[PDB]
Amino acid sequence: INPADLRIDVYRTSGAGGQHVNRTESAVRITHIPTGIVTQCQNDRSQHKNKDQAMKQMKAKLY
């Protein structure tokens, strides 16, 4: 995997059950542009973990 080949988009988690989650861009998505395939993760509440998770997912999908 090359990191430039795909991109990473961050956005807000659906069902924002509080003043913090109402605002925070914890939800993530990776689009692998040449393959066209998409994965996303909003399981965690920290963006950093989420991004990692979705990257793993993306890798799995690619495999």
């Binding site: 920290s46 963006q47 950093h48 973990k49």
Partner: peptide
Amino acid sequence: TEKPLAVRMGKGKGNVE
């Protein structure tokens, strides 16, 4: 040595690299 990301200040020294 670096602390992990999105982590508060206390709770011991971080991890090495």
